[PDB]
Amino acid sequence: ASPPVLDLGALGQDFAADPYPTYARLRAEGPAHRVRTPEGNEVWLVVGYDRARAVLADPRFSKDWRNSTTPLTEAEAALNHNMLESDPPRHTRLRKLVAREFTMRRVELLRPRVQEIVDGLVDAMLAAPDGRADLMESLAWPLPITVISELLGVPEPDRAAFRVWTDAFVFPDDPAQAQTAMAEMSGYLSRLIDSKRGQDGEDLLSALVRTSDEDGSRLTSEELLGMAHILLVAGHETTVNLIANGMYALLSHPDQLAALRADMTLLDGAVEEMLRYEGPVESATYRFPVEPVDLDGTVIPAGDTVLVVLADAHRTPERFPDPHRFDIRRDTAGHLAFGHGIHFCIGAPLARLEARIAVRALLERCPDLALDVSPGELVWYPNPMIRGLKALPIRWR
Ligand code: HEM
Ligand SMILES: CC[C@H]1OC(=O)[C@H](C)[C@@H](OC(=O)CN(C)C)[C@@H](C)C[C@@H](C)C(=O)/C=C/[C@H]1C
Numbered sequence: 235a236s237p238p239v240l241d242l243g244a245l246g247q248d249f250a251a252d253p254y255p256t257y258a259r260l261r262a263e264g265p266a267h268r269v270r271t272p273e274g275n276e277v278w279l280v281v282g283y284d285r286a287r288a289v290l291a292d293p294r295f296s297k298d299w300r301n302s303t304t305p306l307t308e309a310e311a312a313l314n315h316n317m318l319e320s321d322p323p324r325h326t327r328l329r330k331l332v333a334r335e336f337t338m339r340r341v342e343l344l345r346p347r348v349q350e351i352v353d354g355l356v357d358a359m360l361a362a363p364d365g366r367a368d369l370m371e372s373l374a375w376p377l378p379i380t381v382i383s384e385l386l387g388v389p390e391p392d393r394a395a396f397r398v399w400t401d402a403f404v405f406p407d408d409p410a411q412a413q414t415a416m417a418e419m420s421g422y423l424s425r426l427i428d429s430k431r432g433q434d435g436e437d438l439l440s441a442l443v444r445t446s447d448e449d450g451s452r453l454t455s456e457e458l459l460g461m462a463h464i465l466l467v468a469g470h471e472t473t474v475n476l477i478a479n480g481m482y483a484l485l486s487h488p489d490q491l492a493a494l495r496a497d498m499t500l501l502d503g504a505v506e507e508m509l510r511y512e513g514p515v516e517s518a519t520y521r522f523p524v525e526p527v528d529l530d531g532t533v534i535p536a537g538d539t540v541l542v543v544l545a546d547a548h549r550t551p552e553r554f555p556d557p558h559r560f561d562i563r564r565d566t567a568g569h570l571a572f573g574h575g576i577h578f579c580i581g582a583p584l585a586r587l588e589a590r591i592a593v594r595a596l597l598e599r600c601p602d603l604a605l606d607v608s609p610g611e612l613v614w615y616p617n618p619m620i621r622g623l624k625a626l627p628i629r630w631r
Contacts, residue, residue, distance in 0.1 A: 235533075236268065238268045239267055239269065240269045242256070243272035247613070247614070250615060251610075251612070254545065257281050257545065257546035258281075258546065261282045265285040265529040266534055267279050271617070271618055273406055273617065275539070276539075277520075277538075277539040277540065278540045278541070281543050283548075283553040286542045287574055289540065290570065291574055294524055295522065295523050295527070295540060297318060297319050297321060298319065298320055299314055301522040301523075302537060309413045310416065312417075312459065313420055313459060313463045315460040316460035316464040317464060317577075318519055328461065331452075331461070332438070332442075332465070336584060337583065338583040347381075348377075348588060349591055351376075351381065352592050355372060359372035360630075365630050366629045368628070369478060369481055369626040370478050370623065377474075379393050381588065384437075386438045386465060387437030387439045387440055392422070392426070395418075395419075399418060400415075400466075400467055400471050402416075403415050404615060404617055405617055419463070420459065427443060427462065431447065468581070471622065473514075475621060476509065476585060477589050478623050479513070479623065480505065480508025480512065480589060480593065481592075481596065481626065481628075482605070482623065482626055483507075483512045483560050484562075485603065493563075495597055498597070503562050505590055506566035506569065507564060509569055509572070510548050510554065510571060512560075513621065514571075514620055514621050515571060515619070515621075516617075517542060518544055518573060519619070520541065523537070523540065541618065543618070548571075600628075602631040604628065604629055606629035612624075612626075
C-alpha cells in the first residue's frame with residue numbers, strides 16, 4: 235500500500251464531472267486508499283461517512299506541516315501559519331483573534347448590505363434582453379468576493395486578481411502556474427498589509443495589522459499574512475462554488491425547484507441539501523497522522539498526507555438514505571460540508587447568509603428560471619479537493 239492504486243488524473247473529465255462512482259467503488263473495498271491526484275500529489279483518501287467524521291475530529295490527525303513528511307514548497311511556506319494548518323495551541327490563539335467577527339449574530343448585521351449586493355447583481359443580470367446569462371459570471375462569483383473584500387478591506391480594483399489567482403491554485407494548468415499564482419497573491423497581500431499601517435482603517439485587515447504591531451507574540455507578521463490568506467481563499471471559491479453548484483443541483487431537479495418556489499420556508503433546508511449533495515469541499519484540507527493510524531487493517535504511516543473525502547461521506551447510504559436523490563426536505567443534520575470538530579468552518583453563518591439571500595433572490599426574481607445548457611456541455615474541475623464548474627448558463631422568461 236505505497237504506490238497509488240489509482241491515478242485520478244488519468245481518469246480524465248469523466249471523473250471530474252462525476253467522481254462519486256470512483257469513491258463508492260473504493261469505499262466498498264475499504265476506508266483508506268493511496269492515490270495520485272490529477273495535479274500529481276500522492277495522498278491517501280478516506281471514504282465512508284463514519285470513518286470520515288471520525289478522522290475529521292481525531293487529534294491523531296494533525297494539520298501542522300511540521301508533521302508532514304512532504305515539505306511545503308517555498309510559496310506555500312509563506313502562507314501556512316494559519317489556523318486551518320495548525321493544531322492547538324496555535325490554532326486556539328489564532329481562531330480567538332477573529333471569532334467575534336464571524337458569529338451568526340455579528341454576520342446578521344451584514345444582511346442589508348448582502349441583500350443590497352445580490353439585488354443589484356440580479357437587477358443587472360436580468361437586463362439581458364434575450365433572457366439568458368451565465369449565473370457564475372453574474373452572481374456566484376461577484377457576490378462573495380464583494381462581501382469578503384469589504385470585510386477585510388481589499389480595494390475594488392484589486393478584487394479581479396483573486397479569481398485568477400485562486401483559479402490557478404484550485405485547477406492548476408501545471409504545477410508551476412499554481413506556485414507562481416500563489417507567490418503573486420502573497421506579494422499582493424503583503425503590500426496590502428503594509429499599506430494599512432498608520433492609516434487608521436476600520437476594516438478587519440486594519441485591526442489585525444494593529445494587533446500584530448502592538449504585540450508580535452500575539453500575532454506574528456507571518457500569521458497576519460496567513461490569516462489574510464485563509465479568510466480570502468477558504469471562503470472564496472468555496473462560497474462561489476456553493477452557490478453555482480447548489481443552483482445547478484436545484485435547476486437540474488425540477489421537482490425540487492417547484493417545491494421550493496411553492497413553499498419558500500423550505501429555503502434553509504434547500505441550502506443545507508445543496509451543501510450535502512454538491513458542496514464545494516469535495517475533500518477536506520490535508521491531515522497528517524502523528525503516529526501510524528490503523529483504519530480497519532489499513533495502516534497510514536505517520537506523516538503521510540490524508541484527504542477526507544467529504545463528498546463520499548455524503549453519498550453513504552447507511553447515513554443518508556437514498557443518497558443520490560437531491561431532496562430539499564431530507565434531514566441533512568450531521569452533513570460534513572463545513573467539517574467537524576475544532577476546525578469546523580468559521581465562515582459558516584456568513585456562507586449561509588450569502589447563499590440563502592442569493593437563492594431566494596433568484597427564485598423570486600427570475601420567472602421560469604432554468605438551465606440553458608445541456609448537462610454534458612458543462613465543465614467541472616478535476617481537483618478532488620474542490621467541486622466546481624466553469625460556467626453556469628441559465629435562462630428565464
Ligand atoms: C459554502 C462556503 C464554505 C464552505 C463549504 C466551507 C467549508 C469549510 C470546511 C469543510 C472547513 C474545515 C476544513 C477541514 O477540516 O479540513 C472550513 C474551515 C474554515 N472556513 Fe470555511 N467554508 C465556506 C465558507 C467560508 C467563509 C465565507 C469563510 C470566511 C470569511 C470561511 C473561513 C474558514 C476558515 C478561516 C476555516 C478555518 C477554521 C479553523 O481551522 O478553525 N469559510 N470551511
Ligand atoms: C476548506 C476551504 C479551503 O481550504 C484552504 O483555504 C486551504 C488551507 C488552502 O491551502 C493552503 O493554504 C496551503 N498551505 C500549505 C499554504 C487552499 C488555497 C487550498 C486550495 C485547494 C484552494 O484554493 C481551496 C481551498 C479550500 C478547500
